[model samples]
Target: LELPADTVQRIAAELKCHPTDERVALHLDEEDKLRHFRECFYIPKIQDLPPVDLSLVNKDEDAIYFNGNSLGLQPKMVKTYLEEELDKWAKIAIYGWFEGDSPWIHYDESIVGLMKDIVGANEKEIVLMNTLTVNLHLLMLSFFKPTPKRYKILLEAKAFPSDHYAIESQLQLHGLNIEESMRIIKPREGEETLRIEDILEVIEKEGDSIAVILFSGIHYYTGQHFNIPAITKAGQAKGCYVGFDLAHAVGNVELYLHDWGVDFACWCGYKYLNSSPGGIAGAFIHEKHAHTIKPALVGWFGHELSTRFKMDNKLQLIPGVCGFRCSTPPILLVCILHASLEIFKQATMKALRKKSVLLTGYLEYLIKHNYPVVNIITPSHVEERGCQLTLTFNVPNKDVFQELEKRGVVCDKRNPNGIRVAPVPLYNSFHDVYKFTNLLTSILDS
Candidate 1:
């Protein structure tokens, strides 16, 4: 099927370049709507990355950053926003909470509206608080209720370490045997990515024994985007509570938390969301389950907004996800994050996703078609993955990655053989992808 007219026009601009032509990168960069968005971020100018011959490269001013899958480029506005909050702290002192431009009394509330749009949640269903693992632990307290007949927790076999630990601890806390309460699903033999068919099959066969089903919205290592709608439906069909750890997927792709009927979900903002390091995390609770499940954790902030000042009145409650709050959040960090979220407000997820597919596709095309030494471990199918491509080099047990980095090509290289490169739609350009492949090809050639 043909892409929309503008998409075709956009592609045509770059596709006009010959396959081996270096000008293709420039053409693609020239046509990107988000090419201008790159200016909004902080691009580090490095004279050297390490031991490799940095002088051999044409551009020493800007590092070829492809690590947004791990840490996002900082937004320019974070400093200004943070200073605004700092000024409030200075002038008002103790009165800052209610008297300032953005009151610290209920400061986090300002962020929820913008974040709700990013994750596709309603106002009540979404709340920004805590870290990723902390929120996962808190949500598990409510969602992962293991009964005798249905006691096991289902998850991807190779989920992030924090998730593995969090789920394992939840099982042990419930006095369930670790071996019996945890159910893991691995990809088929000789395969790296999980198939949806196998995932559904497991749910069908063992859903009766599974109380909660949790998986990452995107596989952190492989960059495979799990089919949220399909997975949620399948788990619910088997009468299981379904949740997602969307740390990698949230801003990287379009999510429909409310529409998909996801039981609960949480994500860290530092990656694609471009929040500061160890930034404030966001959580979503399906409205249907919001009031039904009482908050497992509570604090002064979780109390009724009207009587929030009445510290003596500990019994009053606020319904829904806000009720899950445990403390007064760091307003400064939220301000820093609010700056990044503001950028997201300007660009719709639909437009960002369209550009992401094309940019990532270009990277895949150049890498796979041009270089024969490395294997792309991330899924080729657009629907199955996001902007990242994990490349496994053919020559194993070697430090081709260290070589790539020292050469001033900045991308994440997993120990063993894999290198994860992400062309983030927010700041990266087609020229970035092209330069990456061009450098990588030279490295492999040597």
Candidate 2:
């Protein structure tokens, strides 16, 4: 079921049919599909649940963690995985490297295989590797081969802080100043978000001088899903390498990394992937790039698995994405990732995206009608975003956040004046959205 903008606006108006009537709120709560998903998660009810006061101020109480975009909650299965690893450590000790059922020597491959499916990449094109920034740096070292004529790198001006830092350092490493070597892309005046046409125009104008075109697959702050295929084609048309930071995109949207001809990409698994904090990060390298370049920064793990134990003087690089690994795999973390991927394996991206569009669109509708004082900063079109909706309080932001928290309606607050509410498909319910909107409306009216 597709959501048309006019229909959404009409629904929003209906929500306020009786501004102060609680029955309207009740009706909204009854219609959400995500209601059951909330129960699947471990929601802490501190004061009433005996033995624990699960309040944010209480160190022992679980914080209403709406910061999944920053770090996801630990899956219950993560505990089981940790125990298994600890048992191996206690029993087999160092011999676990090759003696265990799933040897530590090749532990990353399983997680890498799962990640390939998540990002719609071929088995040979993806790997579970270092953190997001580290992988980005490694990929850039190979792909950002700037020449005297086409030496500039093109990227969005409002990229995440780490991306900004990485790009700046990369430029400095090449002995080039930002003014001379970097091109920052921004939305045109009066536009709240960047348009595809504007991005293509920039590529056309500066294609000759651009050596690489890099952007986040899903923008962190605005939650804009950039047109990866179009951007890659545009960059290639201009004779530039195309790369993406999938930090917020992987597991959140449908991807076709291999078919899209993305030169390289990197992502963290903790957010929509539901892997816990500091979980494995993944990277993709198209076959074309994989065959031509050796990893610029080499480590023992990148060596062929068969020869890794040889300890010979020869350095042999393994083929494809496997060669990007720089250290022994994090086996316990990989297991945690495996458990999460098991859950995702059942649902296709097409199904998840369908639910996401409905949930977020319903949220936007509710916000516009019930909480008219709030301003939605996210785009209106389903084609433009994923599951997140960022809202700006027209007034009294702190009071709104605190009041919502008191009612068990969880969401994240950005510094100064914004809040982000995300309705994840696996664990959030329609009832949750209804409750959130009711709480928001009541708080605003008071």
Candidate 3:
């Protein structure tokens, strides 16, 4: 229910122009501190997009790619990094693991230091591992241990389908009744986002029965950033493990998982992390739980490298998050991720978040001022949202979404109504937002 008047005021005061003025976008773009970052990644051309109607606009123009929430545009350096590794493999087939700028055996080590800043965790607490759902399953096995008095697992009603299935299968593995042990908190009737107060109230009231409080760091459909620290505090007070599925939040918002005393978290790199589609993923476990929580499965990669080749059938497990890794790190994927992380190293999450709030805020101001028929379901509070704005139109959404495609706007449509637009700070521009808003206006008028 909060209005983003503060953001609009900042735009007016800082840019020195009315937000509605077309010149304001140009002014803001010129003033943007991170504007040069747009050159690091690629933007799809209008004619290159599958759904584009060539008759609608200049084919050579860059399509307004507002889909970073799903998959980030590829970083230019990915090619160089990948080729370097490929060269090493060809130069010394067997020695590639030990010799190179980045040793194949220790490839993840180089990236984790940079990634630690993004998730706000210690190096030992973060590990690049299996995909999102796989890491979720591994972390759940250790954190979701249930007792007779505290056997319930709590989550949002609208969790990602894979997460829902993973949790259900875990419950089945434990022989627990899904109906009795699964607690789902949902938004009140006619409401699009869950209130933080409501979430806290539930934790205070029913936390004793909740063995694990597993919610997304940011709800994907609504783009609501949950209060991670608050939720962690309340759940721990009730002796429950608190973790997050950060698929939509990582790289999109500021996180302090270690400082917040969060039990665990998992996320994909493809979204704002800008690796590649189905790229490597990450997991974090607070240092406090390193020894107390052990992985249910074991693998050779988890052993201490000093004795990894000793191969005596001895398991010298590396402590904390590193022990969860079950296979050899994929060098090509690591190269791609390393390329993206290099961009993050230079830009930093603080700078990215600063630009993200304003970028998304500008988008909000434009849509609210120009389009009355479009309803924004995402939270208006900058702290409670990322770079995404979920818009639900009064007109037929799929047709309107398809029309936006025909006009060369790159975004995604959810079932039934909402269209999710993400103006990524790493590459998206104020001009991109301005162009999209006006384009939508024209589509509605047509």
Candidate 4:
């Protein structure tokens, strides 16, 4: 039986535990406006499988999930939305495209409206379609144009391996050498992360030679939330195209991709968006660029809806972000995604960001106060970071990871260097943060 607060305090108090012992969590949790949202997802009792036997275990079973930066916890609605599709399929297999309650033909339409405000885009500019990296390659075909005068792509020295790989492959496809065509910016000696001023300096010194400036909205390893407006303006000033891979940025932070004059951007839905694994991806194209750049890659779904099935090889394409589509999306996965986004609409980004700032502030404070060996690699300022806090250990990381596993706290690790703790606003609580670091303190001390 899942008991509520009154019983928690009654039992916790009966044991004569100090106020800071149990109610520190219950009291802090009592103030959370979004506490009820925790019930929206099926939080795992065990982080991974080899499933525990219920009879042998007796204490609290809910494991703290701070891994939303990697893959979000599933929303309760996922099953409801999935059954809608599953039932539609069984009811009328072929006719489901038009006859069903929510037609498969317009399946993606429902998701765009919910995402518009999250990305600060209008209906015409944002579309749910391809996977994150896949969208990058498609958008690159239009934006990554290199000439003799401007022949390099600019990015961080340690951009995620996938971003680096995609850019290198694009260079090879263009018959250019990776070394000659890709320019990178890195931290100065002894620094753990890059500064905004340094990035602007690179644009100033090498602006004339750069064709594209692409970066992650939030650096995966360092948890640095880049100044999007400043970088976009800096790149555009030099006649270089600018875009971002917002894989970790969307859902975790507030963004105005359209207003920032970013030419194009893409992100996966599985992480902060709370969509199921490999859920549909999203793309953004400022209204200004919508008509000018056509997808170098296209498919039947990208055609004008009125004549998509007309079968004419010369059909004109849809004008904006939607034109980047390559094929039909997985209806089940998209519905699963749609279910999660509906929950997001209820806790708009404005409210979520407010709660996130407090939650992350508490996490940083507790970690720094208790464990001096746990050096935080992420930026300290809220404006410079999202919900993530990357922790670096002075000792071997294996010991820390093993401790986290034994304690039933589910966080992610970046080998040889860091551990990422994301106290996601949608479902996590102050107590979640408190318990996570409190357990960490014990392991380190012992």
User: What is candidate 3's lDDT per residue for 1-446, written digit by digit as tens?
Assistant: 43445655666777677767777778778878889988999878989888888898886888899989998999988999889888888899989888766578888877898898999999899999889999999999988888889888989988889989998998898899999888889899999999989988988999999999999988888998999999999999998999999988999999999999999999998999999899999999999988888887888889999999989988899899889998898878988999999899898899999888888988998888876588999998788999998988886533789888898898999876888999989889989998998888888877
Number of clashes recorded per candidate: 0, 6, 0, 0
Off by over 4 Å in 2: 4-40, 46-65, 396-399
lDDT of 1 by residue, 167-224 (tens): 9899989899998788999998999899999999999999989999999999977888
Report the error of model 2 at residue 111, Å. 2.5
Which ranges in model 3 have alpha carbons more than 4 Å from their true place? 1-18, 396-398
**What ranking of all candidate models by lDDT puts the best one first?**
3, 1, 4, 2
Q: Deviation in angstroms for 251 in model 2?
A: 1.5
Candidate lDDT values, in order? 0.83, 0.75, 0.88, 0.83
Which of candidates 1 and 2 reaches a greater lDDT? 1
Q: Which residue pairs does candidate 1 place in steric collision? A: none
Q: Candidate 4, which segments miss by more than 4 Å at Cα?
A: 1-24, 47-60, 396-398
Model 2 scores what on Cα lDDT? 0.75
- What digit string (tens of lDDT, one per residue) describes model 4 on residues 1-446? 32223333454576566533645566657877888888999888753423333343334667888999998998988898889889889989978777856788787866788889888898889878878889899999988877888888999978899899999998898888888788889899999889899999999899999988999999999999999999999999998899999988999899998889999999999999999788889888888987898888888888888878877878688888788886876788788888888888888789888778778877876676565577899998767999999988776534777667666677888966688999989889988887787778777776
lDDT of 2 by residue, 291-408 (tens): 7867888889888877887989488898776787888877877878887786676565666777777767767776776655787877787878888888777655447776666655
lDDT of 1: 0.83
Looking at model 3, report the run of 10 residues with the lowest lDDT sum: 1-10
